[PDB]
Amino acid sequence: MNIFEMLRCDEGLRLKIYKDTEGYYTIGIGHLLTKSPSLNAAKSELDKAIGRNTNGVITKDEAEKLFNQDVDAAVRGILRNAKLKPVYDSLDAVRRAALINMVFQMGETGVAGFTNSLRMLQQKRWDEAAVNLAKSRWYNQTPNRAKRVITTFRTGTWDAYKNC
């Protein structure tokens, strides 16, 4: 298991524009297009991202390319973030994957706001961090995915990703 297989497991793969859990226009592997309510705005962002007239539908390769860019960007955002970087550097390889997962889902800003949780991860207080992470809108809105990520931080293994 690796970050790619992990995220592919959590987000799924859709070749036509869809609405995410929050009601936002998305395509491929969790690639947010726009928070705007206009499907037209969404098709426009899509065409711009892909470099061609897609008519709202993309191929597997196109989906994968967007996915590769998004993972890369998430990693680079963590490395450029003064709050995130030190945590990431302190973690083992599995747990790093967990943090990357959160950033991909909720953005750099969102994650950096988890002040107390970040501090506990840095101190390697796994059980305490797992409990604090769960006290969030994140966990309440997408509890199955959050539990999977939280278990990853708690155990430092890929057990939560067995049935993928």
Nearest residue to 62 (alpha-carbon basis) of 1, 97, 14, 3: 14
Residue type, 68: N
Catalytic residue among 5, 10, 11, 62: 11
| 117 in a labelled binding site | yes
List the 25-28 sheet strands across, edge first.
14-19, 25-28, 31-34
| Residue 10 designated active-site | no
132 is in an annotated binding site: yes
Q: Is 20 a catalytic residue?
A: yes
Q: Is 163 a known ligand-binding residue?
A: no
The catalytically annotated residue of 5, 10, 20, 64 is: 20
DSSP state of 24: -
Is residue 91 annotated as involved in ligand binding? Answer: no
Distance CA 114, CA 138 (A): 11
> How many Cβ atoms are within 10 Å of 107's Cβ, its own excluded?
14
- Residue numbers belonging to the annotated binding site: 32, 104, 117, 132
Active site residues: 11, 20
- Residue numbers belonging to the annotated binding site for substrate: 32, 104, 117, 132
